[PDB]
Amino acid sequence: PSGESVVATEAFWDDLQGFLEQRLKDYDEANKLRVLFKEAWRSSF
Amino acid sequence: PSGESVVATEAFWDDLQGFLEQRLKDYDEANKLRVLFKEAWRSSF
């Protein structure tokens, strides 16, 4: 992986939010960041 | 943690990029995303 196709996966963002949940201790906030970061990644194109 | 003060830490973003490195298998790409996502988080304010 060069680092893109995996980022384009729901699995990536699920685990990404999983990490966010671990650190932030908040599902909803981690969810907000999952979306925000994914949209930022979308703007990376 | 409500999910913000930890996100405001370099440690958070370091581990965040660590996760990105694990999945993406690329330090530079993971770094790009660390910055991008952090700037997105900045725009969350």
UniProtKB/Swiss-Prot annotation, chains A, B:
It is found in: Cytoplasm. Forms homodimers via its C-terminal domain. Component of the get4/get5/sgt2 sorting complex. Binds directly sgt12 homodimers. The C-terminal region (residues 201 to 272) is involved in homodimerization. Component of the get4/get5/sgt2 sorting complex involved in the GET (guided entry of TA proteins) pathway that leads to the insertion of tail-anchored (TA) proteins into the endoplasmic reticulum. Get4 and get5 form an obligate complex that catalyzes the transfer of tail-anchored proteins destined to the endoplasmic reticulum from sgt2 to the cytosolic targeting factor which then targets the TA protein to the ER membrane via get1/get2. Belongs to the GET5 family. This is Golgi to ER traffic protein 5. The gene is get5.
